[PDB]
Amino acid sequence: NRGGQADPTKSLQAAGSSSSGVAKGALTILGGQICMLGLQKQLQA
Amino acid sequence: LSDNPQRQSVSGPLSSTVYGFVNNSMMVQLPGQPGIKPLTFANLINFKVD
């Protein structure tokens, strides 16, 4: 009792261990958006 | 009807069947000091089958 690195790719490396793949979410939102715009256009058509 | 904290509710017109009523009615929490225990291992064991 007296003594004596900035790696954005790492954000996707956690997708396998305690899954944290954020670009997978980015893919999901991008696909959702493309679907929304396609449906809105074709419904207006 | 056993304790299933991961039972999904029936939505839309499928909620208008007696069987769907059963599935939905097992979820409503009576305020009698609920003892239904939410699970602790649901985020580490992962299952992405579609």
Distance from CA of B11 to the nearest CA of A (A): 21
Name which of A17, A19, A20 to mutate to probe chain B: the one with the most chain B Cβ atoms within 10 A of its Cβ: A19
In the chain, the amino acid numbered B6 is Q
Please tell me the distance from the alpha carbon of residue B16 to that of residue A43, in angstroms, as a whole number: 29
Residues 6+ apart with CB under 8 A from A30: none
Structure tokens at A5: 């690195």
Report the structure determination method. cryo-EM
H helix runs in chain A, sequence order: 10-13, 22-44
Residue of A nearest to B43 (CA): A18
Which residues of chain A make contact with B46, given a CB cutoff of 8 A? 19
DSSP assigned state of A18:
S
Instruction: Give the integer Cα–Cα distance in Å for B1 and B44.
Output: 25
- Select from A10, A30, A6, A26 the least CA-distant residue to A18: A10
